[PDB]
Design a protein around this ligand. Structure first.
Ligand SMILES: NC(=O)C1=CN([C@@H]2O[C@H](COP(=O)(O)OP(=O)(O)OC[C@H]3O[C@@H](n4cnc5c(N)ncnc54)[C@H](OP(=O)(O)O)[C@@H]3O)[C@@H](O)[C@H]2O)C=CC1
Ligand SMILES: NC(=O)C1=CN([C@@H]2O[C@H](COP(=O)(O)OP(=O)(O)OC[C@H]3O[C@@H](n4cnc5c(N)ncnc54)[C@H](OP(=O)(O)O)[C@@H]3O)[C@@H](O)[C@H]2O)C=CC1
Ligand SMILES: NC(=O)C1=CN([C@@H]2O[C@H](COP(=O)(O)OP(=O)(O)OC[C@H]3O[C@@H](n4cnc5c(N)ncnc54)[C@H](OP(=O)(O)O)[C@@H]3O)[C@@H](O)[C@H]2O)C=CC1
Ligand SMILES: NC(=O)C1=CN([C@@H]2O[C@H](COP(=O)(O)OP(=O)(O)OC[C@H]3O[C@@H](n4cnc5c(N)ncnc54)[C@H](OP(=O)(O)O)[C@@H]3O)[C@@H](O)[C@H]2O)C=CC1
Ligand SMILES: O=C(N1CCC(c2cnc[nH]2)CC1)N1CCCc2ccccc21
Ligand SMILES: O=C(N1CCC(c2cnc[nH]2)CC1)N1CCCc2ccccc21
Ligand SMILES: O=C(N1CCC(c2cnc[nH]2)CC1)N1CCCc2ccccc21
Ligand SMILES: O=C(N1CCC(c2cnc[nH]2)CC1)N1CCCc2ccccc21
Lengths: 266, 270, 258, 262
């Protein structure tokens, strides 16, 4: 996909119909707040209505054109399928789909917890695919954008996050493949893979305390960069405190192997 | 993990107890056959007893210490877990677990077929975790190996294989992560990820279109390279018809970042 | 340095005062011609004046704002220094200094030939530094550009071209270093390093015939790319017929370290 | 080239005939002392006649098989070629040529110091090619090694060190190209390009005093690591206070293109 070769302006999100999953707290909540100041229409989701309501309250206050919430579990594919239709109904269409939610996880050595491995695949990966299917028709109509929020754990290998790593790796695998398919089918829907480092969210901070020690980037700026990358139709976003990360994490060998062997099949 | 700074010898496998999954045809059958010539104890699986039967008979003719099949679907996690116990009880241990099977896949544009995405994750990824879990106590005992058969599509993106790539990518993320865990937990179980290009299997050959077919590597040499790599406790195995593809498949950047972030944690909790 | 975040328009060169070295044949000549159709002011150089006269006369025909030549050898450091002032006098200033000349080289195993090492260093590197110094005050006034023509042999190691590789490597070491200095000194003169693969020029084609089996990119498209990089104030320009080259050539580790 | 698939042992240098340039002070002096401890024959050179004699007397005390000095400037290409001939006569051959000297450099922005650019190139790079040419016949006879001491400034770009960087970059371009040439023409002479970060030499410590810098690595260990690399026939040696710095130094892309073009 070709990104919009121009500078980001907040006016790009004005009146834009956006979905934010995992938006009751952390990066999701921060993304909804950014989209509210921009005068966008937001539909937010998580399981907890109480925390979701509070987010909506601040969204309307901040100046969202409209702000709504729908609670449910991304463990349930029916909910996922329905939420998109419901969200679409409320905004009267869809421009951007931000897939951000993840199953609750902890830094632990993997032993025998297949239930968790399965849950991670269903919530962190499978549900993103169901949400993409439900939203693709509306996105085609608006020449919209799919925004996939991933991690450095979905580009390189880390211990204590095997089930998580696997789910995030699958997002790259799937989404990077449909991006190639959208190019050939001439489907004008952009796909942004967001590769994030450690962010100062309540959840991350509690999980990493004592176990891991490294700088945690601000969630406010993290969210803006995810929205920026999405609006500019960038294939990939890299966000982290360190700057070796950013530069080293890109894979030119991968892009050759992809391109210099793309035009080698009819 | 730290590998074996020795050259491969066919006797490294003599009398070794190996499970070969998806071994009734293609690369699996070839691995079973190679292990048979090496005089290994072999247990093979697929869903089809008819085809598994032919592989077993040929394995004994080729010189295997022993050869047995157990039929079932890796769609079923109860079969997967039981299969390992039974296989290991039959051989009186396990030194090598070769995870090769996949669900039937073809080249197509993704078309809202969530079922195919879920099946790919269950058969190609989850069944692999179930097998590993089930087999680790035995592999810890013999200071054994886990061999995970992957694809170029499990490292780089390609159209027509979304569901398939997602499962292959998921194998890299999970097994590469657990490998790092085995190093800190001092678990002497090697993990090998095999990155394969186009191989001349009846399945791959029916799937692909055009002159691309003549750029396929032999299944027999491929099966041998996987065995070799696995025996030498190598982290990754690259096998392609092209030398330039094997050079582009490496990721020194990833390996550096993995080493840099290794110092960022205190393991003294688990 | 910060490059121009816009698309290349031939207009960027209209009435711009440009020096092109080694402009009698090959890529240098092709650059003189491109700047001519773009309506630039060109002052060309090489040793052969009869060949240069042809170049100047064709530059005027193509639409140059003005076209002149000053013949000499870049072996003569006095010439190099004086040529810049003379060129700058003829145009009444300088916008772009394109450094393209090289001493004649061949594909040969190294044994003994110190002469060719010293000659390559003086002509392919030392003269470039003398011309830079001499053109610096003019370029600082115009917030101009320095364009350095290098090769793959100046980024990676090849046999048969040791003396030439050494000079090209030196060019990277030199110009990349002072570029950093210009940024910290707020010197708004840009530096463009051009890394070129094999190009179908007469001289290179004879040099590699029956020695190196490789496809050659065209000199016309090559020269244009050099001008674009310079005009767009890019730090580096990569140009070769192979695309495996173009992507692997950048060095994130060097950037991190920098 | 094929590096030695061996573990470095000090015994590898016992009775070897080694040249060390820039051996009156710094890293070069430390390499002489290390080679002395290893029981090697050493021929040292730099301009400082009095200091070189003191180094030689120390080398003899440390256990060198033999130790000699030849004072002169590497600006003089005649001295460079005449130095190898004499060094060869003093030891009765040559097993390793350690090219370590540089002309004196300070951290300064570039203005119009073409004298410093030309001098840096003559001393830091040209005398190295000249020394190489003279030593090659003896090195071909012993299947010997050429050890070229470079810097991080000879791989990446830093301000204040323009003339130095170019000369260091030139060494890489030349020696790496002759390394390909020797590998194909079957010349069993190894070429080690050493890439050093900041080292605690008086010259460098004085040179960076007015700027904020990383921890300087110890000269004694650096010198030994230059010898192990050379002794082991390694193409490149990286030495720095930081592992991070050393991991970032390797260029796997160039290694690939190099292959692609061969
Ligand atoms: N924070 C960091 O350091 C990093 C974060 N990331 C990525 O950023 C994203 C957001 O992470 P972060 O902001 O830290 O996460 P948070 O834990 O702060 O928020 C997660 C959100 O997902 C919701 N959620 C949890 N379980 C479910 C479920 N079963 N169904 C639906 N919604 C659910 C939560 O609400 P509720 O519990 O109410 O359902 C919450 O709104 C993730 O994709 C993560 O992988 C990547 C790298 C680093
Ligand atoms: N051929 C190629 O070009 C490449 C192959 N690979 C990898 O090598 C492996 C084998 O590929 P290849 O030899 O080509 O494949 P084949 O199709 O020849 O073999 C697949 C095997 O898996 C078995 N199988 C199928 N479905 C199931 C199931 N539900 N449960 C258990 N076993 C099952 C099949 O037997 P049955 O139908 O009786 O169950 C058969 O033995 C895979 O991991 C593949 O991804 C990777 C890259 C390229
Ligand atoms: N062609 C290729 O494949 C590649 C070319 N390059 C670079 O492109 C540049 C030009 O190459 P190309 O156009 O191919 O070469 P050409 O030999 O065709 O042109 C070289 C030019 O330099 C002039 N020149 C030669 N010697 C001297 C001298 N002693 N003093 C002054 N001028 C001199 C020549 O004219 P005269 O004899 O009249 O003085 C001629 O104008 C060089 O920097 C080269 O490294 C880089 C990579 C590959
Ligand atoms: N120190 C550091 O941080 C780093 C050092 N290096 C490399 O290590 C090498 C030496 O470093 P270092 O030991 O720090 O430098 P020093 O200044 O301590 O030593 C340089 C040596 O060269 C000699 N020398 C100076 N001028 C001449 C000349 N005209 N002709 C012949 N010999 C001369 C000096 O002795 P005398 O003055 O008596 O002639 C001296 O022994 C160089 O290759 C340098 O690039 C690379 C990276 C970092
Ligand atoms: O994204 C994470 N995680 C994994 C899951 C947890 C989480 C992520 N978002 C909310 N919780 C903790 C941090 N990463 C990626 C960036 C830093 C990190 C360092 C060590 C281990 C894991 C991680
Ligand atoms: O691993 C594969 N596959 C994917 C699925 C098919 C398959 C894999 N195993 C048996 N059949 C064909 C080859 N790869 C690797 C090389 C050939 C190929 C060409 C296009 C897309 C993907 C792939
Ligand atoms: O730049 C060159 N050269 C070296 C000098 C010669 C030359 C350059 N310009 C005129 N003649 C031939 C090409 N290179 C770099 C690009 C390809 C190449 C392949 C094999 C040998 C040398 C070279
Ligand atoms: O080798 C150097 N230099 C350049 C020449 C000087 C020198 C080196 N050895 C003796 N003197 C000072 C430091 N280096 C290498 C270490 C890092 C560095 C960072 C910024 C500038 C220069 C340098």
């Amino acid at each position: 996909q070709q990104p919009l070769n121009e500078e980001f302006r907040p006016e790009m999100l004005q009146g834009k119909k956006v979905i934010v999953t995992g938006a009751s707290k952390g990066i999701g909540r921060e993304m909804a707040y950014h989209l509210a100041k921009m005068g966008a229409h937001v539909v937010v989701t998580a399981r907890s209505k109480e925390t979701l309501q509070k987010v909506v309250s601040h969204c309307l206050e901040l100046g969202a054109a409209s702000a709504h919430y729908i609670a449910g579990t991304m463990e349930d594919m029916t909910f996922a399928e329905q939420f998109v239709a419901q969200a679409g109904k409320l905004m009267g269409g869809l421009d951007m789909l931000i897939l951000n939610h993840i199953t609750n996880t902890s830094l632990n050595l993997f032993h025998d917890d297949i239930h968790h491995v399965r849950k991670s695949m269903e919530v962190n990966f499978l549900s993103y695919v169901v949400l993409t299917v439900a939203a693709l028709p509306m996105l085609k109509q608006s020449n919209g954008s799919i925004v996939v929020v991933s991690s450095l754990a979905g580009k390189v290998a880390y211990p204590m996050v095997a089930a998580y790593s696997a789910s995030k790796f699958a997002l790259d695998g799937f989404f990077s493949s449909i991006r190639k398919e959208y190019s050939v089918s001439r489907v004008n829907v952009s796909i942004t893979l967001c590769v994030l480092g450690l962010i100062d969210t309540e959840t991350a901070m509690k999980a990493v305390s004592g176990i891991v020690h490294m700088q945690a980037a601000p969630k406010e700026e993290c969210a803006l960069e995810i929205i920026k990358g999405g609006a500019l139709r960038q294939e990939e976003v890299y966000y982290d405190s360190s700057l070796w990360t950013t530069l080293l994490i890109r894979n030119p060998s991968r892009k050759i192997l992809e391109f210099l062997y793309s035009t080698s099949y009819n």
